[PDB]
Amino acid sequence: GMIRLGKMSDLDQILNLVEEAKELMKYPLLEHFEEDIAKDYLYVLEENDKIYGFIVVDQDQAEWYDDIDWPVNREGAFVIHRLTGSKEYKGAATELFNYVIDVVKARGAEVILTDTFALNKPAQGLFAKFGFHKVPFYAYYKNLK
């Protein structure tokens, strides 16, 4: 519902969510976020003018994915590269993850992939919540059928 694509004007909030995540668990990412936004690959969950989480999804797969013996076909698969919610609303992560899974299903996709590094350590439970399967860091896949 008010998940929408992120815009350049949302960057400061996007960055502050990243740093908020880092502070909970304790340069080059600004450039990569700008690119994600330019390519319309980043969605945000927003109420009032405030951003409560974001997610980056596309079909670019990590070069290292090629080093794994996957049990599913990857040709044309979607990939969730990063997902973050907020202190003020942790549930934003779940809504975003879920919104993206629905869009890829609607598009006829069969497989959505991701990896441990897409989520904050304490959010790792979401891999389970959404039925992803592993293939210490892990790569994950979800068969959408």
Side-chain angles (χ1 to χ4, degrees), residues 1-18 20-21 24-25 28-30 32-46 51-62 64-68 70-74 76-86 89 91-104 106-109 111-120 122-123 125-128 130-145:
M2 192 78 301
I3 288 173
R4 56 166 177 79
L5 289 171
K7 297 185 292 177
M8 219 59 71
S9 51
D10 298 314
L11 187 51
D12 59 355
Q13 290 198 66
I14 290 170
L15 290 176
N16 184 75
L17 289 179
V18 170
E20 180 178 290
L24 192 167
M25 309 167 303
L29 79 174
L30 205 181
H32 197 271
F33 282 125
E34 287 174 343
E35 287 174 5
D36 291 336
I37 285 170
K39 295 171 186 179
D40 285 352
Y41 292 162
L42 185 149
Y43 291 90
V44 293
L45 185 160
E46 171 225 326
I51 287 166
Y52 293 101
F54 66 94
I55 189 165
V56 174
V57 56
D58 60 47
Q59 294 177 300
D60 299 330
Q61 298 183 20
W64 70 271
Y65 282 15
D66 293 8
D67 301 319
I68 307 172
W70 299 84
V72 74
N73 187 350
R74 290 187 295 156
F78 282 82
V79 178
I80 298 179
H81 298 288
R82 194 70 175 88
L83 177 57
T84 312
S86 61
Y89 175 35
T94 306
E95 293 298 314
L96 286 171
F97 208 152
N98 192 90
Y99 170 101
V100 167
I101 287 166
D102 282 18
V103 171
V104 305
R107 292 176 174 176
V111 52
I112 180 174
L113 28 106
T114 187
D115 62 76
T116 298
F117 307 118
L119 277 53
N120 306 317
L126 297 185
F127 292 125
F130 293 99
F132 283 76
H133 293 78
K134 294 179 174 60
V135 293
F137 68 102
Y138 310 97
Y140 290 89
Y141 70 87
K142 178 175 195 176
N143 185 20
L144 302 176
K145 64 192 187 301

